[PDB]
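Hi all, long-time lurker, first post. I run a small reading group and we've been trying to get comfortable going from sequence to structure in the token notation. Rather than ask abstract questions, I figured I'd post a concrete chain and ask someone more experienced to write out its structure so we can walk through it together at our next meeting. Sequence below, copied exactly:
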Amino acid sequence: GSSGSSGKVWKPGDECFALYWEDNKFYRAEVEALHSSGMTAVVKFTDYGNYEEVLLSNIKPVQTEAWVRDPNSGPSSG
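-- Answer (accepted) --
Happy to help. Here is the structure in token form:
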């Protein structure tokens, strides 16, 4: 299509951070299934592994393991 568009869409099978309904804190999770309507979605919390209905506007994309190897030692003893 066209490259160069701001935005972010969720999908069933992506790890994300959802705000607990009892802690209201950002915790790890995974988009279990979105809602036809397009407002809330079922996300599974890793903390225990239970599903919770949270809004899409209350979810954040989890960073990826962009590790980098190199023969040059980076961090050292302080």
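A couple of things your group might point at:
The chain has no helices and five strands.
Residues 14-62 form a domain with the SH3 type barrels. fold (CATH 2.30.30.140).
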